[PDB]
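Re: D0Y structure - here you go.
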Amino acid sequence: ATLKDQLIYNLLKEEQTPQNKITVVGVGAVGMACAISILMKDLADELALVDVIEDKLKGEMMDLQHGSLFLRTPKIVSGKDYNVTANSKLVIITAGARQQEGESRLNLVQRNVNIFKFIIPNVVKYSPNCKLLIVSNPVDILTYVAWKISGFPKNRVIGSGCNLDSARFRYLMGERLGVHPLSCHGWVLGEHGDSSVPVWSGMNVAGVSLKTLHPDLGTDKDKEQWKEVHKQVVESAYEVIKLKGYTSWAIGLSVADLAESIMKNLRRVHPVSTMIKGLYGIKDDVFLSVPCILGQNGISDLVKVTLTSEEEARLKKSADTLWGIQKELQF
Amino acid sequence: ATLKDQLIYNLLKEEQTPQNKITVVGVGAVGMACAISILMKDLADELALVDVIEDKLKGEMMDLQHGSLFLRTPKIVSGKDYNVTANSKLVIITAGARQQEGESRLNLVQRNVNIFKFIIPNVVKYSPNCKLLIVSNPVDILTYVAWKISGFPKNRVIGSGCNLDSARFRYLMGERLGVHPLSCHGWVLGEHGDSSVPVWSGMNVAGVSLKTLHPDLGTDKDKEQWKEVHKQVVESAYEVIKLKGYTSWAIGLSVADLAESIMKNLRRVHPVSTMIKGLYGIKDDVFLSVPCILGQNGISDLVKVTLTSEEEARLKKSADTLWGIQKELQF
Amino acid sequence: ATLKDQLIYNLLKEEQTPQNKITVVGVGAVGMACAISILMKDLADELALVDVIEDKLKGEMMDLQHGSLFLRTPKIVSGKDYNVTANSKLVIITAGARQQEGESRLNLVQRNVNIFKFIIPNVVKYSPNCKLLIVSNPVDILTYVAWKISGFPKNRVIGSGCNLDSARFRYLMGERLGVHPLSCHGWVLGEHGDSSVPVWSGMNVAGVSLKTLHPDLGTDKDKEQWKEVHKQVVESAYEVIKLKGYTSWAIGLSVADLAESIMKNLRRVHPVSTMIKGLYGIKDDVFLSVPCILGQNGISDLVKVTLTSEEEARLKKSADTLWGIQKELQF
Amino acid sequence: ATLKDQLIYNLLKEEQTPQNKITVVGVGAVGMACAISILMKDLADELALVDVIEDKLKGEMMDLQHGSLFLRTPKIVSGKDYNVTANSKLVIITAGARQQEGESRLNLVQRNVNIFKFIIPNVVKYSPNCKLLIVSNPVDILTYVAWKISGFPKNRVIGSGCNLDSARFRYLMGERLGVHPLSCHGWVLGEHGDSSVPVWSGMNVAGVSLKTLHPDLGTDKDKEQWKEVHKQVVESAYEVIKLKGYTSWAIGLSVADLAESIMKNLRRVHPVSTMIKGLYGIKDDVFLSVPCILGQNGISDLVKVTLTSEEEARLKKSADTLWGIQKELQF
Ligand SMILES: NC(=O)c1ccc[n+]([C@@H]2O[C@H](COP(=O)([O-])OP(=O)(O)OC[C@H]3O[C@@H](n4cnc5c(N)ncnc54)[C@H](O)[C@@H]3O)[C@@H](O)[C@H]2O)c1
Ligand SMILES: NC(=O)c1ccc[n+]([C@@H]2O[C@H](COP(=O)([O-])OP(=O)(O)OC[C@H]3O[C@@H](n4cnc5c(N)ncnc54)[C@H](O)[C@@H]3O)[C@@H](O)[C@H]2O)c1
Ligand SMILES: NC(=O)c1ccc[n+]([C@@H]2O[C@H](COP(=O)([O-])OP(=O)(O)OC[C@H]3O[C@@H](n4cnc5c(N)ncnc54)[C@H](O)[C@@H]3O)[C@@H](O)[C@H]2O)c1
Ligand SMILES: NC(=O)c1ccc[n+]([C@@H]2O[C@H](COP(=O)([O-])OP(=O)(O)OC[C@H]3O[C@@H](n4cnc5c(N)ncnc54)[C@H](O)[C@@H]3O)[C@@H](O)[C@H]2O)c1
Ligand SMILES: O=C1O[C@@](c2ccsc2)(c2cccc(Nc3ccc(F)cc3)c2)CC(O)=C1Sc1ccccc1Cl
Ligand SMILES: O=C1O[C@@](c2ccsc2)(c2cccc(Nc3ccc(F)cc3)c2)CC(O)=C1Sc1ccccc1Cl
Ligand SMILES: O=C1O[C@@](c2ccsc2)(c2cccc(Nc3ccc(F)cc3)c2)CC(O)=C1Sc1ccccc1Cl
Ligand SMILES: O=C1O[C@@](c2ccsc2)(c2cccc(Nc3ccc(F)cc3)c2)CC(O)=C1Sc1ccccc1Cl
């Protein structure tokens, strides 16, 4: 007999389908940061990685596998073929090269819609009941694209949206007040990135509205310029790219937080991109961030935030812009 | 009054010392994986990052700070100046560029000795009571260098040594047996990397010695080629470099495990590099991996492993080689 | 030589002063639930237990020590003598038998002031720089007693106060809305227990004020009876005592959450009992719950919550009642 | 319209089922310590509690529910009816009053067999695919009883067995050597409690056999009395009962560790009670502890420990005694 058979007596071989499997598509800076965060939070019993660069993909898989002794995820797999992703509860899309210098949004949309045409049918083929979590940019457009190609119901297509924007805002608010970000509440909604909307009415510490205490909050005439907090969210994003060339840790940590609510059915509220048709005068098939309840069926509910006329106008303008790009797309 | 003063009443403004501070020196692939693993394990109340590339350093600091909402480390600081590292309990050295394309594994000696000449006195200036954890290669030589320059007692200079080698070995053992690496015990000692020693006598599952069950274990006569498990440790290290260009995740996870035992005073046993003079016929000031008890004073004790004649001869050969290089170094 | 000396070579026998020590005084239902919660959250490197019943104390210590394999707190000590508590960062008081049936508040305070007269000087003698966290009831009165006897500055004397009341409120709110309590914000302030104040203005989900949406919120004329969410906090407390005889798990978990902010210097905001003199027209030396910023120096700051005239009147009435009892105390 | 419908827009109201449910049967000292440990380890998405004392059951459920804000288990349910336990992955039996002073092993068996006659069919009815984890005493006899009544394959019927005995042994070993119990390996096998077997050959630190270093280990020729390390396991168990009246924390922590390997499919090796028929000359349907690989299918494999003739004779004697009691049982 072999050493294995001499040491171990087998009662059964009968392997089951993975019970809490997560797949990450695209093992770049963002994808690997999502992967390490997910592993360190014990969210999955199986992690699958997919990319088109075979050597980098294998090397990343091996490097994570070599840390198994310090993890509680007994199976890490990878491949260019989507058969490695079979029976995933959650599939995270972080694919396509990051935006290049001088590269426009329309050019990013062009190439990423193209790869989604291959990615999404392959994901759906092997995990037809998965929740799709889109991170790739422009995240609001690509969440619509994933929804359209997949044919999945609204609840199972989630865009990262304004989750990173709100996390950055809460960090900046915390720094300003000398309070941990967990205790500094504030929501950044609408279109992810440059055109996002800070909801000044909800900015609070311990339920004490900062807008009620300081009526000039968020206005350009504010003597203390609290609008700086939202402006620094956009500025810090560009600054990080200027200084290191990409963002990985902050987006990876924010994605693992969404994955935790989904995998553990927590029903916590997060700012994520969802189908907002029928809200704020929006009539088009567009995905924008609102506070969503996240659980085992993805987005089961959304919070109906009271917005000012200015805030509503900004979301409607974003919806018009996004729909303008979307109507010209070919699926 | 400002909005901050309107919202918050201050009881005292007494600036106090960090209680569980960790510094990481060199924010490359290894340093940042050490950082994210330490942050995700809640080991520090303050993290300080140091490097010579100012833009990359600032970008890395900001990226980690932007994930604060999902962490429990309230302060992340960085700087080229070592004043940012003041009062660290643990200082991790992951500095110096990794081994370049046509560079000798040894070419790191001269250039890393030169950078350590400036790093170590600066670390000692601001944290004279810290534990020093050396990761930079050749890790055994550089741990000796850190010890010599710092003037610290033996217990406060720890080399990552064979911690990654043993973690890889236990992953490979686990794969062969169908058992989690946590339950697959085995020790790889001596010189980190190519010249490491697998201690076949200690390889076990549930206290059942694999060598007792299979006497050919670790021999060239073994029809099952169990010796290939240690050889695959060395081969997988080269394979990861070939596939992705560097190793980050596995070393980061292993370093956070050592940091946990130190910060929490666990007194767990780890294979790390320590001053081995007085053991295995070694008379020179050389650092090699043996199982060490790690706690709040660093290495308080070491395990005296019974080695075979061939194992002892390999450690003594490594000591002769390391000392040969070390005696020619100028301080 | 002994087996220990044959197996292990000692580098240094020097033991450092405790670095992250917590003491729990009174190992009853509350004390032990605080103890298990602190241990499972890896908050301390040393846990000390104190009581007057020597056998129960030793049994509780041993029972925790027997679970050491599954914990990361390497030292668990106990004793009737407070020398075991030396150099604690945090001392938690859960001493005195729980309130008996037919026993009045005045009876409860008299008893507990009599034991605090011995406890507090003993705690101060061995840990003069500790933070004191009072749990024993009436918690607001006993926090004042601990502050008076200790002579500590007000930032280092923290009462559990309305932390459990707010946790219960958020659980009930979450059940009604179908949202996790983490995403259901609401503050219960003032006097702990029967006379606590729900601050309806701060009750929100994702920054959306429930009071703004539903102006009858918290009024008796409310068709949806949202006021019952606070009334059920008080009813649920009496119900738990009626059904099992005491509360342990919920208070244990809430105390560990306060211990986490203190030990890790998080600066999160919690509803805890602090010296309220100078706020809400209160002129007496009374401790009431307001949102406090908790860190390594205890309460460094407090949030100035805007209260309605009714809310302010209730806190002032509680201050008058508490002071009325406090002025007659003899210690 | 309601406040809930004003605040939250529902996307779907699909009444879904838990993916990772655990049930605890018997909410006594052991049962509730298992529950709190399981909750603090984030192992379940739903926890069900069952008992026959309805008030105590409801009070325990409520007390856990009130701590929801500090947990990540969104649903805690209870009931006398087993419909609350439907589709549990793991069912833990901690039912039947603890053995009383002057109560014989036979009397404890008889009353617990009677209670299992009702419990086990009820558990099987609602969770036919669950893993059964028996804690109630005499644990080896009651694991056999559960297996007989359930009709489950032997991989899905696990007895707590020598898991607590080995945890206590490793604690005592760690105390003597000044090493954390995680780094002190040693296995206590066979019959749980008084008649358990310490496997001296497997006792090691870092793969260094204590028996090889100290040949008198486990004998009376031992001037250091290492045999007491096993004897003190039995003595400390009686001592804890003498001092506090029961054991809860250590058994609770040990059970949560088994639950973690099962729920997360870790395939770690644990000393648990399994059907040992066909091993060590044993021919009867008896359950004894050996090192078992634990995962999503329960016990998939067992480690074949090489025992000395004396060790083998002690296990066969335990099997004869257990079978002697079992053959007279009425189902
Ligand atoms: N939503 C947010 O808040 C947010 C924040 C930061 C970054 N991002 C986005 O995340 C995306 C990734 O960023 P990055 O820095 O990791 O880029 P990257 O260039 O480092 O990595 C991209 C990876 O995708 C892979 N890839 C390319 N085509 C593929 C395909 N057809 N199938 C599978 N994999 C493929 C690449 O090989 C590469 O490994 C970008 O779109 C970026 O804008 C989003
Ligand atoms: N001990 C082990 O098991 C193990 C395993 C893997 C890698 N390593 C070692 O870790 C080291 C780092 O590897 P890497 O891949 O992260 O290299 P890297 O090139 O990615 O990063 C090196 C960093 O050090 C910085 N640096 C250079 N000089 C400095 C100075 N004087 N002060 C502070 N910082 C300075 C660089 O700017 C750079 O950011 C290497 O020596 C490598 O061999 C050790
Ligand atoms: N602040 C809150 O929200 C909150 C919630 C629940 C309970 N509590 C309070 O916690 C306290 C303890 O409750 P319990 O149910 O654990 O009581 P308990 O009767 O179970 O235990 C009390 C313990 O205190 C010990 N003790 C008595 N005198 C002592 C002394 N001089 N020194 C040290 N220890 C001594 C007892 O021996 C006993 O072990 C009560 O006052 C109770 O009201 C507070
Ligand atoms: N395997 C081990 O290592 C180990 C260690 C310690 C204790 N134990 C055992 O755990 C068991 C429980 O101990 P305890 O101290 O918690 O006892 P306990 O008296 O505190 O609690 C027993 C509980 O079981 C309930 N119960 C009784 N009949 C029931 C039924 N038909 N259905 C459901 N629930 C029922 C009781 O109402 C009670 O709540 C004992 O058998 C004890 O010996 C085992
Ligand atoms: O933080 C990021 O990194 C990216 C970024 C940053 C500024 S605009 C987009 C990112 C990530 C990686 C690469 C690039 N390349 C890039 C950036 C700007 C250019 F003008 C051209 C190319 C960009 C991608 C992205 O969406 C974010 S989050 C973000 C971006 C803008 C404002 C607010 C937020 Cl919260
Ligand atoms: O796993 C690694 O990555 C490095 C490595 C890998 C193989 S030799 C050294 C590493 C890290 C980063 C860069 C490079 N560059 C490199 C490597 C080999 C060459 F021949 C030339 C250049 C190397 C550095 C290192 O020490 C390790 S751990 C390791 C190395 C060899 C055998 C066993 C182990 Cl456990
Ligand atoms: O939840 C508890 O348990 C206690 C309690 C519960 C209702 S009044 C006091 C508690 C704990 C232990 C024992 C007793 N004994 C008792 C209870 C009621 C009586 F009328 C007489 C004696 C009481 C002690 C206490 O402070 C709390 S928390 C609490 C209490 C009232 C309202 C709201 C909350 Cl959040
Ligand atoms: O640690 C325990 O507590 C119990 C125990 C302790 C000593 S014998 C049984 C236990 C738990 C709760 C109550 C009682 N009551 C009891 C105790 C002794 C008697 F003689 C009669 C009744 C017993 C139940 C039990 O199995 C254990 S573990 C254990 C028991 C004996 C030897 C070694 C171990 Cl590791």
